[PDB]
Structures are given as C-alpha cells and as structure tokens.
C-alpha cells in the first residue's frame with residue numbers, strides 16, 4: 001500500500017525519542033480520562049495526580065513498552081496477522097489489571113493527538129486515517145481478550 005508508507009514515514013520522527021513522545025500520549029490520556037490513573041499499581045500504591053506517574057520508573061517503563069508495541073505494529077503494518085496472538089493476550093492482561101474496552105478509544109485519540117502534535121503540518125488527513133485503521137486492527141486483536 002501507500003498508507004503503509006504514510007505510517008512508516010510518520011513514525012520515523014517520533015520513534016527516535018520514544019519516551020518524550022509516549023509522555024505526550026499518556027499526559028493526554030490522563031487529561032481525557034483521569035479514572036485511568038489508579039490502574040497503575042506499583043508497590044500496591046495509587047498515583048494521586050497525573051504528574052505523580054511521571055516520577056515513577058515503572059510507569060515510564062510502561063511508556064516504553066507501549067512505544068515498543070506500536071513499533072511492532074508499524075513493522076508488521078503490511079502483515080498484522082503475525083501479532084494477533086500476542087495482542088489477544090495483551091488484552092486479557094489489561095482486562096485483568098482493570099482496563100475497560102472503552103478506554104482503548106481514549107488511547108487511540110491520545111495516539112492521534114501525539115502524532116498531530118509531533119508532525120504538525122505533515123499530519124495530513126490521509127495520515128490520520130492510516131493510523132486510525134492500523135490502531136483499529138490492533139484493538140480488534142486485543143479485544144479478543146474480553147472472551148470474544
């Protein structure tokens with residue numbers, strides 16, 4: 001496809017500073033849905049405020065984990081079927097930690113936000129539509145983790 005090249009080219013500039021960019025994604029996320037904050041229980045403790053998460057090594061490690069999973073999607077953009085199995089698993093895990101399926105829509109908007117802000121004039125509506133499709137496919141696979 002040509003959309004596959006839109007994803008690859010758009011990902012390049014972001015992927016080289018994954019923590020800085022994933023920090024924008026999570027900051028947006030908590031701004032849209034603050035009820036996600038408590039889902040991150042390290043040492044059984046809850047973050048009071050969004051800025052509390054950004055001082056947590058474990059939370060920042062999770063940022064990196066996310067950016068890695070996106071990087072895998074980008075890699076396999078032409079053939080997403082290879083990640084299905086892993087993603088179904090990742091969904092069940094998130095079911096178990098307490099994430100509701102509906103929160104993945106917020107996540108996706110947060111991803112689109114972060115790309116928009118990074119790319120500026122380069123984040124064309126085709127680029128947006130390309131990412132929305134890819135994220136779509138990711139969440140489809142992950143939502144098999146809520147039984148079916």
Ligand code: HEM
Nearest residue numbers: 036039040041058062065066069070093094097099103107
């Ligand atoms: C509402 C959004 C999310 C919440 C509340 C959440 C929360 C968590 C928690 C609590 C863990 C276990 C603790 C940890 O390893 O840090 C976890 C693990 C993980 N999450 Fe998320 N997460 C979310 C979204 C995502 C997204 C969108 C991805 C990937 C694109 C992702 C990838 C991961 C990975 C890769 C792990 C490690 C799983 C394992 O191997 O056990 N998470 N997440």
Ligand SMILES: [Kr]
Nearest residue numbers: 022025063066
């Ligand atoms: Kr992220």
Ligand SMILES: [Kr]
Nearest residue numbers: 026027050053
């Ligand atoms: Kr954050």
Ligand SMILES: [Kr]
Nearest residue numbers: 027050051054
């Ligand atoms: Kr924040």
Ligand SMILES: [Kr]
Nearest residue numbers: 018067068071
């Ligand atoms: Kr990454």
Ligand SMILES: [Kr]
Nearest residue numbers: 068069070072
């Ligand atoms: Kr991955």
Ligand SMILES: [Kr]
Nearest residue numbers: 068069072086
């Ligand atoms: Kr992985």
Ligand SMILES: [Kr]
Nearest residue numbers: 069070073138
């Ligand atoms: Kr993702």
Ligand SMILES: [Kr]
Nearest residue numbers: 086089090093
């Ligand atoms: Kr998983």
Ligand SMILES: [Kr]
Nearest residue numbers: 093094095097
């Ligand atoms: Kr999880």
Ligand SMILES: [Kr]
Nearest residue numbers: 025029066107
């Ligand atoms: Kr996320």
Ligand SMILES: [Kr]
Nearest residue numbers: 066070107111
């Ligand atoms: Kr994401």
Ligand SMILES: [Kr]
Nearest residue numbers: 108131132135
């Ligand atoms: Kr997206």
Ligand SMILES: [Kr]
Nearest residue numbers: 070073134135
């Ligand atoms: Kr994605």
Ligand SMILES: [Kr]
Nearest residue numbers: 080083137138
């Ligand atoms: Kr996928």
